[PDB]
Amino acid sequence: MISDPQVLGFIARTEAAYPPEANGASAADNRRFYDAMCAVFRGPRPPGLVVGDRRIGGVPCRVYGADSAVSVVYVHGGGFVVGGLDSHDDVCAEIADATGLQVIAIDYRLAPEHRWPAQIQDVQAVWDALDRPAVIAGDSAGGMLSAALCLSRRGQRQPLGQVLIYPGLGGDGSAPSYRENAGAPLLRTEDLATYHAALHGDGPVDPLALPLQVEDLAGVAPAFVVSADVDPLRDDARDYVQRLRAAGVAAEWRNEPELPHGYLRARRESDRARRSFQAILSAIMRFAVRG
Amino acid sequence: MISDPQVLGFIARTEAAYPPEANGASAADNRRFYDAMCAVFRGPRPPGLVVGDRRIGGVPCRVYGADSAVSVVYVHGGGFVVGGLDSHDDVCAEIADATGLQVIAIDYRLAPEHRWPAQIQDVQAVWDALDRPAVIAGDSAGGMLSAALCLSRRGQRQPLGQVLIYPGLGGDGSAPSYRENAGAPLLRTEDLATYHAALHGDGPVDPLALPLQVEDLAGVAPAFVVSADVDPLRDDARDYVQRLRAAGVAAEWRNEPELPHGYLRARRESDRARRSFQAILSAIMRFAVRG
Numbered sequence A, B: 001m002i003s004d005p006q007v008l009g010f011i012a013r014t015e016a017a018y019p020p021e022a023n024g025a026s027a028a029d030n031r032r033f034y035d036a037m038c039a040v041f042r043g044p045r046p047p048g049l050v051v052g053d054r055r056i057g058g059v060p061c062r063v064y065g066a067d068s069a070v071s072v073v074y075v076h077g078g079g080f081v082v083g084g085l086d087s088h089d090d091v092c093a094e095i096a097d098a099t100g101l102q103v104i105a106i107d108y109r110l111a112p113e114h115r116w117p118a119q120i121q122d123v124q125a126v127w128d129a130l131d132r133p134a135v136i137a138g139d140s141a142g143g144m145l146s147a148a149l150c151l152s153r154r155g156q157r158q159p160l161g162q163v164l165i166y167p168g169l170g171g172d173g174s175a176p177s178y179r180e181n182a183g184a185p186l187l188r189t190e191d192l193a194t195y196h197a198a199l200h201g202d203g204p205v206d207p208l209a210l211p212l213q214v215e216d217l218a219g220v221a222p223a224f225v226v227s228a229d230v231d232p233l234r235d236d237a238r239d240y241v242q243r244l245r246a247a248g249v250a251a252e253w254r255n256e257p258e259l260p261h262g263y264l265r266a267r268r269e270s271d272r273a274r275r276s277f278q279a280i281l282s283a284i285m286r287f288a289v290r291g
Ligand SMILES: CCOC(=O)c1ccccc1C(=O)O
Pocket: B034, B077, B078, B079, B080, B082, B139, B140, B141, B142, B168, B186, B187, B191, B192, B195
């Protein structure tokens, strides 16, 4: 169990900002509660960073920073029900400022109003419209979208790399982290239903394989996969990196001791979380600079 | 004056541990106050990172992380009078953790007991003995030493890049920052003089101790030069980037509004300083990806 007082403090502040009763509350109510949480922890925008919104392949997007030879496409998390351009704004802004690469955040369609495969179709639509060298990165459900995009766009259009931040990649639940972290801090459980049911293929039945179940991972972009140790999805990161290397893809698994799911919001009060984001930025830069 | 409350608090905490009259104390007392201030701000080491002390080229060094194809040589600051392996330990450890590059910190000999060119000879000793592709980085007087190394090793030989963090580079003192920031927090123009006597006594100054006065800069490694805006030394960064581009060298100038000299120690409590270090890490990673 977590003993780092900084991240116990972060956990306490997240729970206080986010009363654990949001569930059959309403998708409308969960979106409101999630933004109120995000605002507690939100950092300031870097002054001087240019930021504007723009439709790209029919999907609303937010663009951070000046045009660059290599970009970063960021796909936010939220279990395909919550989140948007404002929920992950400061993370994208800091990626842009630190790397000097232009960042494009994708406001993909959310369920229950738009069920799968709307989310991956929107990501593919932005990716195909951008038609440029780019690293792709995402957290949680947005990490799964990032992984699925790479798998569906192999060949010339492949991203230069995939940076996956505590992703859920479709593990079947049998891995140890689902046991060891079943009551992990910041886990809502009542979200897993909203995210499996309707939302995903568990909504009108459909195969459309999730990354951990595709068998030909050969040729997809090199991966940097970072997990929270205290998170049931931890071993999805372990498992996907192990499968990626068996396919001859370069991939690294970084597991973060003492951190829960969602810890990017703790980077302004936790040394552990801040170091993790520093490593995430360096992995992005590593993929972007071509070699 | 600075108005960012986060930075003002950092300055208040610094001044309580390292009173501005320490710059004029004896070397031994100055060293004790500097070490005490370092302890106030020191972050924890990454728990999984291998760290060991080793003499390299005869000079005692500290090595962070496993051996890597590209390394990072970090040269600590402290006006050539204070500092050491422990004073900058957490910065080095965080570079190694974030980049995956091995970091070598150099415990060069200190003034007033060891006059120039002891410091640059110690850095050359380590560099030559390493015999390794590497990026060189340093803060303040350590940035001057990294710039002086690049100018003295322009053959086989050369750093892959130079990351200079609020460096003093031998500006003559007439640029606007020396007046506008003469009474700046944490570093005044008058403190500059005390340390200069401590490095050369009162003899003739070796041209290599003044990179901004060196006539030919043609083939030095490309540079990322970040300055604190509220720092008398700020325009040394602006000036050197200008002179480097006039010599065909690629150079980026980043200036940091609302930050004083020494802001690396504020990265755990200041959004501005935290983002600056994120950019510094990315610049290192940019330069490192080669050989
Ligand atoms: C004691 C902290 O060091 C200094 O203030 C300092 C003073 C003069 C020149 C450089 C530095 C520096 O290397 O930072």
